[PDB]
Amino acid sequence: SLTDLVEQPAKVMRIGTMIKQLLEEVRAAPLDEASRNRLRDIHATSIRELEDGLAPELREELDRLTLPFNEDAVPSDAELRIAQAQLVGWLEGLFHGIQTALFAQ
Amino acid sequence: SLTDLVEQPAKVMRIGTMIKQLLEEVRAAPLDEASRNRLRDIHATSIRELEDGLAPELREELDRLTLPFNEDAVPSDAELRIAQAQLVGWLEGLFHGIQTALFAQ
Amino acid sequence: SLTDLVEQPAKVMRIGTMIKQLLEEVRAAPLDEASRNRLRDIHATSIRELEDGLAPELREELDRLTLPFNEDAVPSDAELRIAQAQLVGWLEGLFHGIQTALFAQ
Amino acid sequence: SLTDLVEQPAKVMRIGTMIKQLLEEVRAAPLDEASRNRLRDIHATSIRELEDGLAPELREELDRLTLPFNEDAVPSDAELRIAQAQLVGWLEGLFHGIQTALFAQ
Amino acid sequence: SLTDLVEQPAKVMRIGTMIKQLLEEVRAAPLDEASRNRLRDIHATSIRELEDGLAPELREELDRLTLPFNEDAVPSDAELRIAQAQLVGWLEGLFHGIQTALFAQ
Amino acid sequence: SLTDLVEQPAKVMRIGTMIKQLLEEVRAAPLDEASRNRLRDIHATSIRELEDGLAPELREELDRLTLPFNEDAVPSDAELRIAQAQLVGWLEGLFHGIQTALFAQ
Amino acid sequence: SLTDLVEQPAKVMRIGTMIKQLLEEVRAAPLDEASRNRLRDIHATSIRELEDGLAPELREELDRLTLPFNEDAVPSDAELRIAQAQLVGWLEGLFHGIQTALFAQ
Amino acid sequence: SLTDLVEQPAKVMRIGTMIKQLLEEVRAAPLDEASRNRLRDIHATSIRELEDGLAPELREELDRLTLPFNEDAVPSDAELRIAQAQLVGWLEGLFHGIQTALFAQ
Amino acid sequence: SLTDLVEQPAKVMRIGTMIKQLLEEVRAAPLDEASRNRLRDIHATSIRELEDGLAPELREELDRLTLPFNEDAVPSDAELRIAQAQLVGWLEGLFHGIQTALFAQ
Amino acid sequence: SLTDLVEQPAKVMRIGTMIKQLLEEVRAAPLDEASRNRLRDIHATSIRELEDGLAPELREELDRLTLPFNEDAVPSDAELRIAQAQLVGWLEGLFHGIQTALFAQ
Amino acid sequence: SLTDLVEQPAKVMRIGTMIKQLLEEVRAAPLDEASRNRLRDIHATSIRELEDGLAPELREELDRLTLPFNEDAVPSDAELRIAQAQLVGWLEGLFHGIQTALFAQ
Amino acid sequence: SLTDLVEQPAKVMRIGTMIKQLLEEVRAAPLDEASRNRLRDIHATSIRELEDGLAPELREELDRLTLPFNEDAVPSDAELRIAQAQLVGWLEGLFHGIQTALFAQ
C-alpha cells in the first residue's frame, strides 16, 4: 500500500531535515566556490542515501524527476537552490501523502 | 464520479507540492540560464508524471490548458513563473473540487 | 433553478482557481513579451473551457461581458490584468450567488 | 415591496462582484489606453446587464444617477474610477437596503 | 414622529452609500477636470434624489445647509471633498438620530 | 432639568455629526479659497440651525462662546479648524452632560 | 462638602470638553495670527463661563492659578498651549477629586 | 497617622494633575520666553497652593526639597522640566504612600 | 528584623519616586548648566532626607555606597545619571528585599 | 530498533546543542581567520565525539554524509556555515525520527 | 546546605539590583571620564559589600572570578560593562541556584 | 547515572549564567583591547571553575572540546564570541540532557 512504499521512514525523514536545513542556510546568505562544491557533493550523496531508503517505484520516480549535476562545472547558487527546493518539495509531498493514508485508517 | 477521476492521489499530491515549492523558490530570488534550463526540464517531466496519474478526461483538459515549452530557447523567469503558477492553480482547484465532493458525502 | 445553471461545478471551480493564481502571479511581478503571449493563449483556452461547463444562459452572459483579445497584437500587462480581474470577479460572484441559494435551502 | 424590486438577485450580485474586482484592480496599478478602452466597454455592457436585472423604478433611478461615457474619447483613469466607485456604492447600498427589510421580517 | 420623517429609508440609505463610496474614492487619489465635472453632476443628481426621499421639513433643512455648485466653473477637488463630506456627515447624523428613537422603543 | 434643555435632540445630533465630519475632512487635506468660503457659509448656517434647536439658556451660552466670522475676508484653514473644533467640543460636552443625567436616572 | 463645590456640573463638563478639543486641535497643527487671536478670545470667555459655574472657593483658587492674557499683544502658540494645558489639567483634577468622594459614598 | 498628613486631598490631587498636564505639554514641544515666564509663575503659585494643603511636617519636607526659581532670570526649558518632574514625582510618591496605608486597613 | 530596618516607609517611598521621576526626566532630554546645578542640589538634599528615614545600619551602608558630589564643579549629565541610577537601584533592591520578608510571613 | 541506534542520547543532545549555538553565533556576525580556525577544530572534534556516541550504522551514514575539512587551508565563513547547517539538520532529523517511534509506543 | 551559603539575602539582593540598574544605565548612553571613575569606585565598594554578605566559600569563588581594577588608570566603558555584566550574571546564577533548592523542598 | 555526573549543580548553573550574560554583553557592543584581555582571563578562570564542578568523564569531554587561548596574543572579539558560544551551548545541552532524565523519572 501507500505506507509500504517507504521502506525505513526514519532515514528518509532525517535526510529530508538535513536537506531542508541546508536549503534554509543557502537562502540565508550567498555562497562561494568551495561552499557550492561541498553543496554539490552533499546533494549527490544525500540523493543516493534517499534512494537507498525508498521502494523501487519511488526510486524510479525520483530518478526521473531529479537530474544529477555535471561534475565538470561548479553549479551556481541558483542551480543548487532549484535542486534543493525540488527535493524538499518532493519529500514534503511524499510524507503528506503517506500521512493522509495513515490518518485515513 | 468526481473522486474516481484522480487515479492515484498521492503521486499527484507530491508532484503538486514539488511544483509549489519550486514556484516559491523561483519567486524568492532571480535565476540564471542553467537554473531556468533545469527548471524547464523539471516542468516537462513533472507534467508527464502528473498526466500519468490522471484520468483521460483530466489528461485531455490539462493538455488543452498547458502548452509545452520551446526546446530551442531558454525561457525567461517570467514564462516559468507563468507556467508554474498555472499548474499550481490548476492542481489547487482540482483538489479543492474533489474534496468538496468528499466532504459532501 | 440557480443551482441547475452550473452544469459541472468542479471544472468551473478549478478553472477559476487557475485563473486566480495566474492573476496573483501577474500582479506579483511584471511580465515580458513571451509571458504575455502565453497568458493570452491561456486566457482564450480557459474561457473556452469555462464556457463548455456553463448553461447557455450563462454562456451568453459571459460572452456579452468578455471580449476576446486581438490575435494580431501582444496585450500589455494592464490589459491582461483587466481581463483576468473581470473573469475572476465574475466567477467569484457566480459562486457566491449559487451558494446563497444553496444555504437558503 | 423592497424585496420585489430586485427581479433576479444572483445576476445583480455577480455583476456587482465583477465590477468591484475591476475597481480594486484599477486602484492597484495604473492603466494605459487599451486597458481603459476595454474598461469603458465593460462598463457599458455591465450597466446594460445590471439594468436588465432590475425593476423599472430602479432602472430609472440608476439611469438618472449614471451617465454613459462619450464614445469618441478615451476616458482617463480617474473618470473610470469615479464611475466604478459610483456604481459599486449604489449596489452596496441597494443590497444593504434590501437585506435590512429581509432581516426585519 | 422621528421615524415618520424618512419617507422611504432604502433609497436614502443607498444614495448615502453611493456618496460615501465616491468620497472615499476621491480621497484615495487626485482627480482631473472631467472627473470633477462628472462628480459635480453626480452631486447635483444625488442631492435631488435624496430630497425626493425626505420629508418637507428635512428637505428645507438640507436645502438651507447645502449650496448648489456653480455650473459655469469646474470645482476643485477640495470643494467637492467639502460638499461630499458635509452630505455624508448629515446623512450619518440623520440615520443615527432616527435609530436612536427606534432603539428607544 | 438638564434633559429639557435640548429641545429636539435629533437635529442637534445630526448637525454635530455634519460638523465633525467636516472637521475631519479639513484636517485630512488642505483647502483653497473657494473651499474655505463654502466652509464659512456652512459654519454660519450650521450655527443658526444649532441655535434654532437649543434652549434660550444654551443659545446665549453658545452665543457668548462662539464669534461669527468676518464676512469681508476669507478665513485661513487654521481659523476654520479652530472654530469647528470649538463647536465640536462644545457639542460633545453637551451630549456627555445630558447623558450623564439620563444614565443617573 | 466636595460635591457641593461644583454648582452645576454639566456646564463645567462641557466647557472642559470644549477646551480639551481646542487644545488637541492646536497641538495637531500650527496656528497663525488670527487663529491665535480667536483662541485668546475663546480662552477669556471660557474662563469667565467656568468661573460662573464654580463655588467662590474654587473661583478664587482658579483666579490665583490662572493669569489673564495681555490684550495688547498676540500670544504665541506655546503660551496658548501652556494656558490651555493648565486649565485642562485643573479641570481633570477637579472632576477626579469630586468623583473620588462620589465613589467613596 | 499617614492619612492625617494630607489635610484636604482633593486640592492636592487637582494641583498635581494640573502640574502633570503642564509637564506633559512642556515635554511635547519646546517653549519660548513668555511661555517659560508664565510657567515659572504657575510653578510658584502651584507650590504655594500645594503647601497650603499639606501638614506642617510635609510642608517643611517639601520646602527642603524644592528650591524657588530666581525671579531675575527666565528659566530655560530644562530647568522647568526638572522642577516639574521633581514635584510630580514627589506627589506621585506621596499619594502612593498614603494609599498603601489606606489599603493596609 | 528586616522590616524594622525601614523606620518610616512612606517617606522613603516618596523620595524614591521623586528620584526615579527625575532620572526618567534626565534620560528623556539633555540638560544645561543650571539644570544640572539644581539636580546636584536635589541629589544632596534627597540623600539627606533618605538617610533621615533609615536605620543606622542602612545609613552606614548607603554612606559607603554613595559618594557626595564635588561642590566646586558642575557635574556632567552622565555623572548625574550614574548617581541617580545607583540610588534608584539601591532603593528598588531595598524595597524588594523587605517585601520578600513581608510576603514570607 | 530505532531507539537502540542512539547509544547514549545525552552526549548526542549536548553536542548538537553546542553545534547549534555555534551556528547561530556564526550567522550573527562575520568571523576572521583565527575564529574560523578554531571553528574548524571544534567541528572536527565535535564530529568525533558525535561518532563515538552513535551506532555503527549511523556512524557509517554520517561518515558518508559529512566530509572532513582540508587541514591545509582556512575554510571561509560560508563553508563552515554549510558544514554546521548540514550537521545540525542531520541531528534534528535523527532526534525527530527517534522521538516519532518513542511517541508511537 | 545551599541556602546556608547566603548569609543575609536582603543585602545581596539590593546590591545586585543596584549593580543591574547601573549596568542598564551604562548601556543606555555613553559615559565620560568622571562618570567612569565614579563607576569604578562604585564597583570596588559594591564588591566589598557583596563579599561581606557571602559565605567564605562563595567569597573565595567570587574573588577568583572577579579581578579588581587598576587604580592608576581610568577604565573604558567596555571594561566596566564587562565587569558589571560578569557580576550581574554571577548573582543571577547564584539566586537561581538557591531558589532551585528552595523550590525543591 | 546521568544525574550523578553533575557533582554540584548550583555552581555549574551560576557559572553558566555568568558566561551567558557575558556573551550577551559582548554581542551587544564591540570591545577594546583591555576588555578582551579581561574576557580571556574570565574565560580561563570560568573554565577551571566549571571543570572543578564536573565528573571526570565530563571533565575530559569538555577538555577535548575546548581549547585554551594563547596567552601571548589578545584574542579578537570574534574568537571570544566563538569560545563563549561554544561553552554556553555545551552547558545548555548538558542541563537539557540531565533534566530529560530527571523528568523521565
Residue numbers in the entry:
A (entry chain K), B (entry chain L), C (entry chain A), D (entry chain B), E (entry chain C), F (entry chain D), ...: 36 to 140
From the paper:
The core particle of the proteasome (20S CP) associates with ring-shaped activator complexes to degrade protein substrates. Alternatively, the 20S CP can associate with the bacterial proteasome activator (Bpa) and degrade proteins in a pupylation-independent manner. Bpa monomers feature a four-helix bundle fold and assemble into a dodecameric, ring-shaped complex with the protomers arranged around a large central opening of about 40 Å in diameter. Unlike Mpa, Bpa facilitates the proteasomal degradation of its substrates without making use of a tagging system like pupylation and without the expense of ATP.
While high-resolution structures of truncated Bpa have been determined previously using X-ray crystallography, the conformation of the full-length Bpa dodecamer in its unbound state has not been addressed. To confirm that full-length Bpa in its unbound state behaves similarly to the previously studied truncated Bpa constructs, we determined its structure using cryo-EM. The cryo-EM map of full-length Bpa was resolved at 3.2 Å with local resolution ranging from 2.7 to 3.4 Å. However, in contrast to existing models, our structure showed that the helical extensions of helix H4 exhibit greater flexibility. Our cryo-EM maps showed no discernable density beyond Bpa residue Q140 within the H4 extension, indicating that the residues following Q140, while possessing helical propensity, are dynamic. At the N-terminal side, the first Bpa residue that could be resolved confidently was S36 which is located toward the same ring face of Bpa as the C-terminal H4 extension.
